[PDB]
Design a protein around this ligand. Sequence first.
Ligand SMILES: O=C(Nc1ccc2n[nH]c(-c3ccncc3)c2c1)[C@@H]1CCN(CC(=O)N2CCN(c3ccc(-c4ncccn4)cc3)CC2)C1
Length: 335
Amino acid sequence: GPEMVRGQVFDVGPRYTNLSYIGEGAYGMVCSAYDNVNKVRVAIKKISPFEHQTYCQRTLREIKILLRFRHENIIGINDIIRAPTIEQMKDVYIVQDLMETDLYKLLKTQHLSNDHICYFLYQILRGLKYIHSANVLHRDLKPSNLLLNTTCDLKICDFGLARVADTRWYRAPEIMLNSKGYTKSIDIWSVGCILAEMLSNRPIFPGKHYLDQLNHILGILGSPSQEDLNCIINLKARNYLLSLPHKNKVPWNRLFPNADSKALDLLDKMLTFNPHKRIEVEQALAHPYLEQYYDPSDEPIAEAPFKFDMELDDLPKEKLKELIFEETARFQPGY
Ligand SMILES: O=C(Nc1ccc2n[nH]c(-c3ccncc3)c2c1)[C@@H]1CCN(CC(=O)N2CCN(c3ccc(-c4ncccn4)cc3)CC2)C1
């Protein structure tokens, strides 16, 4: 019989054996395993998405994007196991490099030194430069999506919500206000939130719902200038902000009194309220805080950026399942 972990069968043998639990979520379950061909330990995740269209979209995006991307700071896909026919296919096993932990877990137990924060931040931005150069928005950057190895190498994961550019605590204010016209800047906001969390071991902008989160945001950043209000397309968003009481900016060094001054200048530029004024990834990399690492010769871009929206939103789940079957065929044998 097949190996089982926490009640889930992982039917990945004979090539992959010695299954051990790592974690789980709505997506399914991830385990470590041993690859008896390549003689290496790997991560394997079991996804079972075919009952719902949304799950199938997230699965197809993950697979398509990660097979197209190739970057040191982005997790790849090494192999995919699924059934030999569409009708038999209920589970999809995605095989990826094994890392040691993720930043969510790390921050639960460890206080990071500036040297660690600086290197992690560098790598996040270096991977994000590639993502953005592919004309893609990640849209769900957060500490659990940052995988780490023993020498502090970092890889971004989870492209299930990514889109071609046309927990809620890491979401940019423009999304919450429904300001319309979202850009790459949404991911920079998320990185700002991750940096603040590396500096303090807790989230900078928690909140019950968007109204609460926005009040916390503006309680720290202070009220948007009229000029920033005038840059909002959505009149409903502008009007909502004009309805709030005036708040002064809280200095960053109040909240993070032991943080590097350069780190706080970059934090301020990332956690800028107006998305048009928010620092872009290439300028972030060039910021003084990251001078120890910055090297444009070693910060590659995507060879062939995505041109067009993937257009998955109104495909039935059964058609998405066929597209998943087709995408996963490159890991099946040829004649
Ligand atoms: O890639 C992911 N995790 C990885 C990967 C490689 C790793 N190597 N080492 C580790 C590691 C981590 C922590 N500690 C030690 C080691 C890895 C973790 C995460 C896990 C899931 N993944 C996204 C993903 O697989 N997709 C996007 C979401 N999607 C999806 C979402 C929901 C549902 C769903 N299904 C049933 C009910 C409800 N929802 C189905 C599919 C499936 C495709 C991002």
